[PDB]
Amino acid sequence: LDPATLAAFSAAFRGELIWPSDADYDEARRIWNGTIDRRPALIARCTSTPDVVAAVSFARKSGLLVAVRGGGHSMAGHSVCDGGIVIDLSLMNSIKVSRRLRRARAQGGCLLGAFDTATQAHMLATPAGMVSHTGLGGLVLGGGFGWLSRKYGLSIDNLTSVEIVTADGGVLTASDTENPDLFWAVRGGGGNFGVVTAFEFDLHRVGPVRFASTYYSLDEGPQVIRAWRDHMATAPDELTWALYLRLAPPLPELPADMHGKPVICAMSCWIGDPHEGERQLESILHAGKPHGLTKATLPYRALQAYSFPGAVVPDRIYTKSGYLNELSDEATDTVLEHAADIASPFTQLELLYLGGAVARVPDDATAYPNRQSPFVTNLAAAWMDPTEDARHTAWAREGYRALAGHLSGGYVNFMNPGEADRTREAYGAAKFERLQGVKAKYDPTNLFRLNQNIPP
Template identity: 40%
Template sequence: MTAPSVKAPALAGLREDLTGEVHVPGDPGYDEARAIFNSMIDRRPAVIAGCASEEDVARAIRFGRENDLEIAVRGGGHSVAGMSLNDSGLVVDLRRMRSADVDTEVRAIRVGGGATMSDLDRAAQPHGLATTGGRVSTTGVGGFTLGGGSGWLERRFGLACDNLVSVDLVTADGESVHASGDENPELFWALHGGGGNFGVATAMTLRLHPLPSFSFVLLMFTPEAGFEVVTTYRELMESAPDEAGGGAIYLTGPPEDFVPPDLVGTLLCAALVTYAGTEAQARAVAAPLLDIPHVAEVVAELPYADFQCMLDDPPGMRNYWSAEYLELFPDEAAEQFCDLATSMPMPSPSQHALLPMGGAVARSGGQYPVPWRQSPWAVHPFGVWEDPADDERGRQWVRDVRKGVQPWTAGHVYLNFIGQEGRERVVAGFGAGNYRRLAAVKAEYDPDNVFHLNHNIEPTSES
């Protein structure tokens, strides 16, 4: 069956020209190819171009433009709004481009545009190296890094974009561009948070850092202890070394051996302390939390790449997320944070997280368009559920969390944590001055706004 919006000769030409595989409705594998992380999104592209090289990406973009198809770009497929898919358009699918090559001499890794965090982490681990990655292993490196990149190691090594050395990009005209500090520096600046607005990243190089050991402390408490746990975690992190990270997180008791059977499926408050160091160091930092009576405890030193897989979100679930970045987190905010957990969708894999910033995040890369990095705390309602009947309840809980912490917000937001929440939120993700500068870069590299399925920056020349 040929996609109705694409003429058969054009489609045959794409199939012949592309090294990778092309899927259209009716093809075997089409439904599998269009499935993404958020099962709430059900879209049917006219063509899915499974690209295997930079040349394939250029061919696919030119094909899309010649056939007047809306273009979406898929890396890891983790956009909560489903921006890596469209209806009746073209998807440039990068999943075949998953190379991850480590250069130990310069401590850097070059990854393909479709690489996931697991690809990167597993390649770096044997060399005792790592860089800031997403909080789950299935996140795509490209979208994660170009959107800023917040993860467990950020307080020690900075955001992922702070570690960006270079990017190979295919523009809306199908041309290849290299961006680095020395080559196309204005584009390189824009790629530190500006996302997929400027082209398709077919490869990127990131700086790696020595990480000889990694440890974590995970404690679970009944909800009644929540306020004490959250405020203790707050005080702990305000004086913690950069090696420490983690979060205070409300969640559903998981069916794991370390959770008492009678608490599985119930609301729990967890404290997670991650540490770029030994178990003994992690225990020392987490001591105030360990002193609070808790119902479950896991403490371990393990390879960072293994830890990254431990918290992977289950596929095939319905997702709705958002975030607020806070200027302050006083006791009143802690009380509100704890109260808001009680309406979280239950039982489900949803999480209600308080994440610490600071450390290298706040010190590094102030020149980049990521103003949210200066906030000391982030509140991240991460709604995940299975039943479509819970959609409105789940969405409303996320909205209520945002509203509930408004008195303490800084007004900025990490766009990778949110869906489509309007232009004002997009501008808030970059800052108004940065947005104007980004719009000028957009006008140079994508004046027709071909790449608009993202947290979109409208192309306008800087006045």
């Protein structure tokens, strides 16, 4: 490490440096995917945009492999690197909300729960992921979907501008009117094009939400999933209905003879009038007998903080996901045969219906692929014992291969560390090559390669 560069970076960087000798280094480098044990040479905790600029320039000059960390939830483990530098944005957590203009400006290191807390102070909101502590950074740059998406689209579908630090250390504002090629690419292209230090979103009024969660016996699985698939094909935007095949959590609402056994966990909500929501959710809650039924009228920030029942954070995860255009009866059976073999109490086989507002955005308006594929299956193995990695990974892998005949594309934010190759297939040829032209203009060095990578 050349000293003049380091020393001038020390004079510009008004944040915290964590070195491999420091006590807090083992914790600071930990990311949510515990199977990713990497030793960065240097962890930089930025507090403002000039901090990131200094961190970007110093990494460019010094030749260090760049990681960027928002909330650290990368299923591929991109946010920590072996022997490089970590531009850590976790301290840049602030949000300014205009209730009157319905505008939220959030720093690149925000967590979802912080963002939704600030907007819900004015009963405002904009779509994002379902787990409170995942980061706004990586989620939004990949698309971002959740409870508000069928009504209001992806997270990017409400983005209006970004402040971004490009590989050359320059700071650019990208929007629909300013650097619009870059705005297209960051809306689905990940961290490939620079470090976003500020997002601006349009917001929506979201009052109380009538919500429901329940569990169905697996030997009623066929009629439940079929009812689910059949209903969502024509369901109104306001109804979001998700299925999570999993081992029943040992919760008092469920009978003890169901604890630990595979079930279907159905979570449903109605974005709109709670009285219309109660009528709507009752029309979908009885495809089979609902066990452990919880129905509530929750403020939207409570809905955001609910997932997942049991409130356990796993240490180790491996995920295989893809989209479906159709969910045949044979595919439904296949899902059920593999869900019955679930081993860890923290593993889920997620089945989501997007569509709605997501699919009414034209294919080419952003960089997010597969808007016209409604279904998402996410085989999400999650466990604690690091000596058991092979048996839980094998469940995701072998379940994915049995469904390969229905699966196409892939959400970049659900990719596991060994899926660097799925990139061209996930984006498609037209989107991949346009992304490469933005990557050629803004990061021709591929300084930012710790992501679902798009080489220039």
